[PDB]
Each structure stands twice: as C-alpha cells, then as structure tokens.
Design a binder for this molecule. Sequence first.
Ligand code: SZE
Length: 169
Amino acid sequence: PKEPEQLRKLFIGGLSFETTDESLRSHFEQWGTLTDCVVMRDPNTKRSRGFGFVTYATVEEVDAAMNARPHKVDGRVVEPKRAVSPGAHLTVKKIFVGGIKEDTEEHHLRDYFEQYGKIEVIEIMTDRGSGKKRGFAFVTFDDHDSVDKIVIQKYHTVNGHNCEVRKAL
Ligand SMILES: CN1CCN(c2ncccc2F)CC1=O
C-alpha cells in the first residue's frame, strides 16, 4: 500500500542549466529510491528550464532528502519543495492552529509541533479585552518544510483536541 505519488514528489528549483535527468538522479538517489526524475526543458531548444522533479518510493525518503538540505547539485544550491493541496506553492513558515479551546498551553503546542521542525514563535491568542484564551494559536518555524508536512496531514491531535491547521500569511 504505497503512499500517493503526489506526496512522494519534490520540486527542485534553481537547477544549474547543466543538470540532466541523470545527474539529478545520481544526486538525489543518496536519500532514497527514485521512481522518477526529470529536468524540465524547452520543447524546441532542449535548454533547461532550471527546475525539475524527483519522486521517491516513500514519504520517509522525501523527509530524508529534505533533512539533508542545503543541496548543492552540479555546483549550485537548489530549492526543493514538497507538494501541498493553482499549481503555485504558498511557501510560508507559519501555521494557524484552531480548535485548541481554553485549556491548551504553550508546552502542548511545542511538544507536538517540535517534531515537525524547529519552532521560533508560539502565539496563543487571547481576547484583547478580557485576556481569555480564544481557542487558537499561531506557530512559526524556521523553515517552510515543517509547515508543508503539517498541512498535508488529515488530522492533528493536540491536548486531546482535533485541531484545524492551515498555512498562515
Ligand atoms: C511543491 N511545488 C512547489 C513548486 N512547484 C512548481 N512547479 C512548477 C513550476 C514552478 C514551481 F514552483 C510545484 C510543486 O510541486
């Protein structure tokens, strides 16, 4: 029962124009089995478009590749990104966490979310007038991949609450 292919892909931006299917594959195979690996090229000139994609056999392999950033491929530092649910990636480092009610504290959010990435800010939202907890929070990470992993999960359970988590701008 394989994970959906969409969740096993990495977009690789910023390629050297001299990177090929073969050199991209040789590089990224260090972190897992690649079922697909392609450099996007112009249909007439064959000149590289400067980006490509690799598809791993498993999500854990995608994680391994992302944890090995920065990647220098054929002499240039590239920009890998995983897919999240217009074809444009909203690359952000902050999430909204809703449904946490009044009993959820910072350590609850930290203990859970720290396994997705390095946390820089936790903001538990309180009422401007009364100071009472409003039942939602924002978490800011040091890097976008944490957020990307978070928002593709179907479920998040924090402090016994089923939470709604979205990218925050
Ligand atoms: C995760 N991700 C982000 C980047 N991405 C792109 N695709 C095609 C062209 C340019 C792009 F930035 C789509 C995708 O798979």
